[PDB]
Amino acid sequence: ALEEDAQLPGEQAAWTPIYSSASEAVKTQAGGLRSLVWPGAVCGGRGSEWTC
Amino acid sequence: LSVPLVPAASAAAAAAAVAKASLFGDPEPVLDPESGEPIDPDAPNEFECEDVEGDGD
Amino acid sequence: VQLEPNITLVLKHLASCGAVVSAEQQAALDHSIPIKRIEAGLRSLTLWGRLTTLNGKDYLVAEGYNVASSKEGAAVYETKYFYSQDGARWSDLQPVDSETATRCARIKGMLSGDPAKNYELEEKPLVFQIPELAVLRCRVDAIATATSVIPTDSTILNAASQVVPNRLFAGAAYPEKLESYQHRFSLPGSGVTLSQDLRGTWAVQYDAFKGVAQVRSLLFPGYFFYYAANELTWGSLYVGDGLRNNDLIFML
Amino acid sequence: VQLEPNITLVLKHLASCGAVVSAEQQAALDHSIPIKRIEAGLRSLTLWGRLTTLNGKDYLVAEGYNVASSKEGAAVYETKYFYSQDGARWSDLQPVDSETATRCARIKGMLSGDPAKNYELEEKPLVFQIPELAVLRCRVDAIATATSVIPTDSTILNAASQVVPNRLFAGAAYPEKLESYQHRFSLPGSGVTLSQDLRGTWAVQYDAFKGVAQVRSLLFPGYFFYYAANELTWGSLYVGDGLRNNDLIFML
């Protein structure tokens, strides 16, 4: 799992969340992660589809 | 050409734009002016909808 | 000749450079920018950029102004900045003192995404607490004074000694050369262009068939500018955490 | 002041009116329009419209020209039309004789979508076979001579007596009135606007806060024109089967 990666300096996780909407009440929104070590590397899924 | 920033016959269009922009994000907590306490937000209605965004896709 | 950059064309031309915004934020901007522009009394207001944060709530930053005037050999734009975290409600991004500017310049890393957070610095042991919005404003100021790119001779001076669009601008003769572009704060007719900048801090890719030039900053990686010569439009955008690239000498 | 309509802004502003194009066709246009414009030697070439067909292969129609001149009190544009069914390869849309113009005017219904098809007409019993591309070109000619909308005083006459963009155009003073717009083929300074058209054949909706006016044709439902006054852009598009609305008196 990506959770067991090398943390960045300061007990910081190496992957940061990204969301599709600013409100937690929209019912069909995407989710994903962005890489801190390699800026520009993104993974993300919406519903049944996903991509890196 | 020399016109104002926005005509005076535009309050309806401005109200429309404010209503449309209020759709996005969460509503800001408003407070009671005389009291100073925040106004209790409305409890949301329970409903079922489709995925309008996927249909747009 | 355009009168103001168009966010649709900007997002269309600079999408290949990875400078993109969310779909919800795109719609929300389409509604929110005119509202704020009117209720602030500004003549121009555009999307300046988007700074990434650690909790996923990136800061959208917008920049507006009313009129630009020539003062002391510089084209000064009395700009005002606003920030947002959803694209719908814009808050003020207030200026920062000069003394605090140094401290926030010392703070590095990706921003937290919590406007109420404040970082700590230690000096001779006096500790200062710097609000996050101060750091954000300072990074925006640095990136702005570094890039602020427009085409050369696209502005002009009028009778009241104000900088106004040159509506008879014909276009850049050689769009693939850095001489065709300049900083915003350089007076018209001053002959100072991007070629007077430190050699190697700008890259230019020009598609001579479609007529679209892309100018990328290498000193602040994340600042992109586009110029379309067949339609005579242009515009820029910053997307990234806001930190300067200090290792540039080793990377060229 | 724009120099030529931008397809991105057109598709962005007229999408609310249902005037849309497929995504693949949008990309294909972004590539194909410059190629054809260059290899035909034309100064201007834009997307004119999109006519729906019975087999799902709608005709995209593009219109281009080189220079417009004042002849006999009319601003004549020597236009040339091209058609396509995928957005990538443009073929010629050749003019039609006057005698055949009447026959193709008599043919109604949604087009077939097969450029090799030909319809049949019967007269005194002499039968004529009219190719489908003839019907297409005449519907385009009718819609073009009916609408062809531009803002008023956006063009001007030059020394060689040619119609050129008025680069000092300041904008329409009253964008919600039909006097602000005119036909393309009306000479500058002639005072003929859309208000001289048959009363009730045009509708205007003006968003006074954002500054975007939409002019819809009611005689040819499907022709939309937009004018953005804060950025001084404009442009039109036709989307539909191409038939005139003859029941207009009963529908108003």
CA C178 – CA C194 distance, rounded (Å): 6
Place of tokens 């008196």: D249
The answer to whether A28 faces chain C, any CB pair under 8 Å, is no
Query: Do the chains contact at D208 and B1, CB–CB below 8 Å?
Result: no
Which runs of E-coded beta strand occur in chain D?
44-51, 59-65, 68-71, 74-77, 80-84, 91-92, 118-123, 126-131, 149-151, 155-157, 162-165, 181-183, 202-207, 212-217, 223-228, 233-239
The answer to whether C17 faces chain D, any CB pair under 8 Å, is no
Among D206, D168, D237, smallest CA distance to D26 is for: D237
Q: Are D6 and D237 in contact (CB under 8 A)?
A: no
Place of tokens 């509503």: B27
Q: Which residues of B touch A27 (CB under 8 A)?
A: 49, 51
Burial, C153: exposed, middle or buried (Cβ in 10 Å; 0-12, 13-18, 19+)? middle
Q: Which residues of A touch B55 (CB under 8 A)?
A: none
Q: Are C205 and C139 in contact (CB under 8 A)?
A: no
Q: Are C63 and C48 in contact (CB under 8 A)?
A: yes
CA C5 – CA C184 distance, rounded (Å): 14
Rg of chain A (C-alpha set):
13
Query: Do the chains contact at A12 and C54, CB–CB below 8 Å?
Result: yes
Q: Which chains touch D (3 or more CB pairs under 8 A)?
A: B, C
Q: What does the block give as tokens for D100?
A: 């055949």
Question: What interhelical angle do D98-106 and D132-146 show, nearest 10?
Answer: 90
Q: Which residues of D touch C38 (CB under 8 A)?
A: 209
Query: Do the chains contact at A20 and C24, CB–CB below 8 Å?
Result: yes
Place of tokens 């800026």: A39
DSSP letters of B1-57? ----SS-STTHHHHHHHHHHHTTSSPPPPPB-TTT-SBPPPPPPPP-----HHHHH-
Counting every residue, how long is chain C? 252
Place of tokens 């108003």: D252
CA C245 – CA C232 distance, rounded (Å): 31
Q: Who contacts C249 (Cβ-Cβ below 8 Å, separation ≥6)? A: none
The answer to whether C57 faces chain A, any CB pair under 8 Å, is yes
Closest Cβ–Cβ partner in B24, B26, B49 for A27: B49
Query: Do the chains contact at D34 and C2, CB–CB below 8 Å?
Result: no
Q: Which residue of A has its CA nearest to B55?
A: A28
